[PDB]
Ligand binder design. Structure first.
Ligand SMILES: CC(=O)Nc1nnc(S(N)(=O)=O)s1
Ligand SMILES: [Zn+2]
Length: 257
């Protein structure tokens, strides 16, 4: 089954998921000089004050923090979006070294990791229906660079020891995702896809310009997780990122000049 190894990594995915070679795949390189400023784009509206986190899970490819999405508690609106998108989970992609890890790149620059806050369009009723629609998901992408620690991330880092291996989960309540946002909400946006199988082309990507900084010690703890289940041979969970895909017939728009 698929993964990030030499024998099952992204270059192999198309054999089981032919849409991997599709017209609106993600991630992409953001060429800052070719992106188009669009004055018609609205500011993002992030309403996370009533967010209810439930659980943190190692699913064998990353760790996910899951939220209660049975009501409009944590929602994303505005920007390029029509309607209301509910937060369902966030996760990260990261590297084995500080010079790599992000999925998106900016003028070919890679960051140490990338945070994805995944939201689904409420008009489709559930997440499973949403992924079948071209406007079904909105994913907010935030870059991480190594520098000073991010206090708001430390609660996540401290629980990782309890979900070291695939399939382990832990109760993870009262986490406030607002502590993971940068100061500015300036963004680029383009139409794209999930970056893991099944690679469905259902995502409006919103990638923030401003990275957040985390400390070397914080990212080091991500790299101690395992792809494998308990009792299996240890494989460190690192480099769980898909390389940039061709832009083809898409334009990246910027909310700022
Ligand atoms: C269930 C779920 O959320 N699946 C996802 N697959 N890829 C995602 S990402 N890397 O594009 O945010 S989210
Ligand atoms: Zn992701």
């Amino acid at each position: 089954h698929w993964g990030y190894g030499k024998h099952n990594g992204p270059e192999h995915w198309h054999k089981d998921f032919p849409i991997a070679k599709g017209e609106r795949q993600s991630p992409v390189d953001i060429d800052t000089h070719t992106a188009k400023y669009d004055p018609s784009l609205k500011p993002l509206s992030v309403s996370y004050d009533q967010a209810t986190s439930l659980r943190i899970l190692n699913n064998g490819h990353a760790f996910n923090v899951e939220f209660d999405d049975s009501q409009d508690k944590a929602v994303l609106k505005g920007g390029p979006l029509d309607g209301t998108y509910r937060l369902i989970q966030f996760h990260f992609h990261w590297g084995s070294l500080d010079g790599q890890g992000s999925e998106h790149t900016v003028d070919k620059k890679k960051y140490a990791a990338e945070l994805h806050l995944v939201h689904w369009n409420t008009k489709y009723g559930d997440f499973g229906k949403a992924v079948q629609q071209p406007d079904g998901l909105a994913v907010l992408g935030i870059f991480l660079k190594v520098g000073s620690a991010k206090p708001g991330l430390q609660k996540v880092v401290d629980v990782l020891d309890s979900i070291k291996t695939k399939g382990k989960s832990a109760d993870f309540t009262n986490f406030d995702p607002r502590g993971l946002l940068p100061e500015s909400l300036d963004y680029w946006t383009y139409p794209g896809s999930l970056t893991t199988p099944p690679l469905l082309e259902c995502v409006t990507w919103i990638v923030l310009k401003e990275p957040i900084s985390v400390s070397s010690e914080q990212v080091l703890k991500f790299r101690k997780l395992n792809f494998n289940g308990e009792g299996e041979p240890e494989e460190l969970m690192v480099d769980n990122w898909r390389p940039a895909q061709p832009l083809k017939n898409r334009q990246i728009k910027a909310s700022f000049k």
